[PDB]
Design a protein around this ligand. Structure first.
Ligand SMILES: NC(=[NH2+])NCCC[C@@H]1NC(=O)[C@H]2CCCN2C1=O
Ligand SMILES: NC(=[NH2+])NCCC[C@@H]1NC(=O)[C@H]2CCCN2C1=O
Lengths: 497, 496
């Protein structure tokens, strides 16, 4: 099956209202930059962002000129002429609108509350989808938690029912309407809804993991924002999943959630796979088309894992733009983030950056010895390891944020497409390295094991293994006279064939 | 409130059937040995043991001669003439009958299975109580498993309903009929029903913890069987409670159940107090009136924490009665258990025993350097610290096994009564020592704390403290944007 390549097309309301394809100072990345070749390299474009209004229906930001919005969307759907597999999805939410303290958070919580609110909301998603010409619905609520998860699940199930009916009504069986969500790529936010992942993923075609932003100014030590595997030399973190409402024993929690652990892309993917009923084919690995920069770093390890003096507030509080050579940073007023396009230009501008590589995390980084800067980002090389991982782990594909940050030739997107589909690319001998793998095992994804059947009336010593009612169990202490499952003394450690 | 002093009176079926008070060779400890003065020092005598039969009803051993049984019970209830607060309870169960591999185990599991089986069983308990003249029901099932706990809880609730009705019908408002159980005194067995402790204790007047037998021949290294506090030099154990079906988070389990830990009396008591809904006044501390003996021990620590060669099987799988000086051990064909009465005689008989004292565990022990023997037991001295703990921790009182093991003068019982009630006994300066205390924190023993009220809309850093809905909470990581109870980033760490 072809791997998904899902690219976000993000355009702020002011750019839609003043949309033009001949002035990059107004619209830096118009749709015309997406050529037929690039359209063929994508399977999905996630147009972003729509929101949920106070009437609890999907809607465009009220400040949007509707004609101009339809025109931008039309330019995207016109790309379908070049690729009969391409879908132009629309994404509802995003951090700004849906985070706990975001402008529209309450609308997300309230829209998923009751059967009636969920029906009205779901109907509105399909109406916007058909009215504007989109091919599916993507929901990026960052992130539901607690008492909101059951409502969220039921809302997704309702949208799925409505989309499936629309597919039949429209005779779209050859390119059925789809439903996806953007999911957390790190344990802290993932812990909000982790316990119910199987129900969340059931109605979806894909769950697109935001497996980036795993390092940033909000952290004390500089680190790679999207390390594939872990570097024992780098910082480690508290495994928040150990605190999710799972109903697992201390041993089960400890085995599933090693802590501290390396916050990496492999950790997020493996954490999803540890849950019963979450298929690998629905998991999509997100990658960043931008880098994160830090100032005030020490030398020694190329700026890696160093203390730094980078402001964490949002927006960037100062007027000081210290990422040398990054003029895009001046335009956007923040020296802490730079598009791959810009970072590549900085490497061709003889500005004093060294492009370095960490062979454990399989990611590149920039180090500016003279000014003490460190930049963590991804490129065509790190994507070879990530694409190989997607293939080996049988994942659904790749998602990225965002199209406008690729260079002018679309090299990062071309690389991803190449690694999945080019007959002349051969990664059979690509060495995945010895970086740290996530080794948790969940009571939901135990290995096949074999042991003698439990014999009632027998007393077992500590460490004894038996098979009983579909699983292999091990005793945690001695003189065990109880049957497995029926008490605290036994630990499920494997599944019976 | 007077502390309970609950002493078991155990008499095997063959002794009831041949009951006599003038021949210690037949009945070593007849009811007449419980003089008026001893009767006044007890608040309860637990007559033991009755059982649950295949008919799923409370009942005596079938081999029991009922007329002799009634007569022994009448002698015990006659003691009430000497103490208006005394209750003669009867105990159903015990290890022999009710353990997982015991002869009557299935009857316990089956009796609590359904509303009908529970009603029939509860009724039989009250019928037996009234027919023989007992003052309450004590159940010693060792021990219901997770799946049987709901039925067990329901059975206790049904017995409580019937007993409360009987108290009113019999005009016993001044001395109500009571319901108690012997509960596990170690984490391993306690983990079977720990998660529902509040429900188990609700219908009871007391839960009598079997806070002894915490060391035995079944263990690799010798140890004190009822250390009050821990000795870092001694063995430590896996904290089975962290595996109970509590539904708690990793941090919550970890802070409540440190592992490994010291298996002590304090650990069991604190583990009970960690549960919300378990009142200290219902917890009764059990103490042994006997010691446990080990052979094959080596020197360096007076026999403590040593490997040994004592058979752990029951019955005693040999005929070698190696506990020098212990005559009762020959009578009972087991050298691994010796009553305090017998130990006291062994100490004054020049048999090679040295009495030593561990000041961390606050318990005595015997060491026999010549033959390599070790004996862990309790005495009037160890009871000073346990009595002070009972008072300080506001526990309900003490329980002990068994009356026939005290010496002829009843000194152990007199000591317990003195420590609780004597106007001229003053333990204000008794130093409780530096032994290890159990430090777990749970929902039932959160410390009082103060913190700023949680404010909706505020973002909190890691380690921040706030008060919300009556408790003080702390963040486990940073950038916390939702409320305690609705965001798993918060840990309840204090109350008020
Ligand atoms: N300044 C911010 N944090 N927000 C703007 C970045 C958009 C943010 N980043 C992302 O990678 C996309 C992926 C899905 C939803 N997203 C988001 O909400
Ligand atoms: N046959 C004997 N003398 N011993 C039987 C051991 C009794 C065993 N030990 C005890 O201390 C009592 C307390 C409650 C239940 N018990 C028990 O089941």
């Amino acid at each position: 099956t072809r791997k998904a390549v899902i690219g976000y097309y993000f355009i702020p309301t002011n750019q839609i209202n003043n949309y033009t394809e001949t002035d990059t100072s107004v619209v830096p990345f118009p749709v015309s930059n997406i050529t037929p070749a690039k359209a063929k390299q994508l399977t999905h474009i996630n147009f972003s962002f729509l929101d949920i209004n106070s009437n609890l229906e999907c809607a465009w930001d009220p400040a949007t000129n509707d004609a101009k919005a339809r025109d931008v969307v039309n330019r995207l759907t016109a790309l379908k002429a070049h690729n009969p597999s391409l879908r132009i999805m629309f994404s509802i939410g995003g951090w700004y609108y849906s985070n706990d303290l975001g402008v529209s958070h309450a609308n997300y919580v309230n829209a998923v509350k009751t059967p009636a609110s969920r029906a009205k909301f779901a109907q509105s998603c399909v109406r916007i989808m058909k009215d504007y010409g989109f091919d599916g619905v993507d929901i990026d609520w960052e992130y539901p938690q607690a008492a909101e998860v059951d409502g969220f699940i039921a809302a997704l199930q309702e949208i799925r029912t409505l989309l499936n009916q629309q597919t039949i009504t429209d005779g779209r069986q050859a390119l059925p309407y789809q439903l996806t969500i953007a999911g957390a790529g790190g344990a802290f936010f993932l812990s909000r809804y982790y316990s119910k992942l199987a129900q969340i993923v059931a109605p979806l075609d894909y769950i697109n993991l935001m497996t980036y932003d795993l390092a940033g100014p909000w952290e004390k030590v500089t680190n790679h924002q999207a390390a594939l595997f872990g570097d024992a030399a780098g910082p480690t973190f508290y495994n928040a999943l150990r605190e999710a409402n799972l109903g697992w024993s201390w041993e089960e929690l400890t085995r599933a959630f090693p802590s501290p652990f390396s916050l990496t892309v492999d950790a997020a993917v493996q954490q999803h796979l540890m849950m019963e009923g979450v298929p690998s084919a629905k998991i999509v690995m997100g990658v960043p088309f931008y880098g994160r920069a830090f100032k005030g770093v020490s030398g020694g390890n190329g700026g890696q894992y160093s203390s730094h003096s980078t402001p964490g507030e949002d927006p960037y509080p100062s007027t000081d733009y210290w990422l040398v050579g990054c003029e895009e940073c001046v335009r956007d007023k923040d020296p802490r983030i730079a598009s791959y396009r810009q970072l590549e230009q900085m490497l061709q501008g003889n500005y004093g950056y060294q492009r370095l590589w960490n062979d454990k995390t399989k990611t590149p980084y920039l180090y500016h010895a003279q000014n003490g800067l460190f930049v963590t980002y991804d490129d065509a090389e790190s994507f070879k390891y990530k694409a190989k991982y997607i293939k080996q782990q049988q994942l659904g594909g790749v998602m990225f944020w965002h199209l406008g940050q690729d260079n002018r030739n679309g090299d990062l997107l071309a690389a991803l497409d190449r690694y999945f589909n080019a007959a002349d690319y051969d990664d059979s001998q690509l060495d995945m390295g010895t970086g740290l793998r996530y080794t948790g095992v969940g009571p939901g994804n135990l290995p096949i094991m074999t042991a003698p059947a439990y014999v009632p009336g027998t007393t077992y010593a500590q460490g004894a293994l038996v098979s009983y009612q579909g699983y292999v169990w091990q005793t945690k202490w001695g003189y065990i006279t109880s049957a497995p499952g029926s008490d605290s003394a036994w630990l499920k450690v494997g599944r019976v064939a």
